[PDB]
Amino acid sequence: KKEFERGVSQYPTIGDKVHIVTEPDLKKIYGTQNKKYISLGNIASVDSIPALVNIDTLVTRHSAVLGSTGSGKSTTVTSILQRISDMSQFPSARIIVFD
């Protein structure tokens, strides 16, 4: 009852029953209680889940956005920059764009 941790401990055997993941289970999987992670969107399957993304690793390690010109990458970058630089939550942002 702790959390969802990557890496299994004991593998299934023959005849084990296979179920389907429900929305609360998805919340358990894709959810975390850390304060660093920031919601950027919703999972494709069910829209009630927030897409938590770390921000320390996003900036300090590095980032990159790749996609076709018809996929609307400009809108995605604009939304990401607007979400990171929120005035109420991040009053001391610092961003330079080489348009």
Added chain:
Amino acid sequence: SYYDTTQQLSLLKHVLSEDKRPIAFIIAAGCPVSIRHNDAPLIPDVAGLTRKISDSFDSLLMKIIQNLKTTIPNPTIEDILSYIRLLQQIPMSGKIHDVENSVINALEESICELIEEEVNVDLPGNATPYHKIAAWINSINREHQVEIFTTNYDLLMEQALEELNVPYFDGFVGSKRAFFDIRTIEENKLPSRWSKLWKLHGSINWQLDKQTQTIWRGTPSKGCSLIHPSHLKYMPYLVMMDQLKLFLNQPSAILITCGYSYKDQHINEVLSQGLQTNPNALIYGLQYDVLENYQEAKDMALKRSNLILLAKDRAIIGKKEGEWKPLFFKLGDFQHLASFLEEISQ
């Protein structure tokens, strides 16, 4: 804690587009109030009938209202009618109101005449939502035919479904007297094309012929009707509720309630029993009001998991109350639901 309308509508459209699952409907009094013929509504809701009875009829009426209000909240037409029939059950019941009896027997007839003359309003042109629903009914040759349950005393469903001639069966068999049949209800050996329409609260064309104590439908007589909500005769009500309960036990059954206020008691209990008996049953409760006005619906949603209650501002799904993601969800209105059905039809 949050829900989005688009995903709910997409799920409902996916559900309605399967012919394997049997489908049904509940057309309560909230649908007729959603169409305007004159400046006044075509058929007023239960509050409208209560107000009309109050301002149309006096001292003994007010005495009866006070007697019922001594232990009950704001009444309805069904409440006062049940009280009148309960008084009629006792022979020497005229001393309760100090009216010496034999006057209530005429007051109830006057009320029945007023109601039966008021509800006969006729249907307007082919643009009615009920016409769209009827067109959607026969649009697809579904292998399980759609059943319809109505609590309305009027005959808008009949006129709309006959204007676009469709298969139909309401339990009565015949041409001159249309004698009510019970066996043909129970074997359920009918071709799949024939549709089924059932009136739980009774119509206005139903006449009790007395004598042999037999029931028959047909031309509406003057004053003689069977508007009874449930009545306590020594019956269509019990067998028809049993039919509804049997339908709710079918595997993968979908039931949609439009314009239902959930204020009835027996209907709520039979729905809860059907939901608990078969977990694969699914009920779409559609309302057009604030969710806070339906306490019984909230209790049922918090009790039964497979009941989906959707209101204008909030929605409770899977024993978890929430709010729409930026009133919304105009599907509660009957006109919007009819437009949705007619656009999904093609």
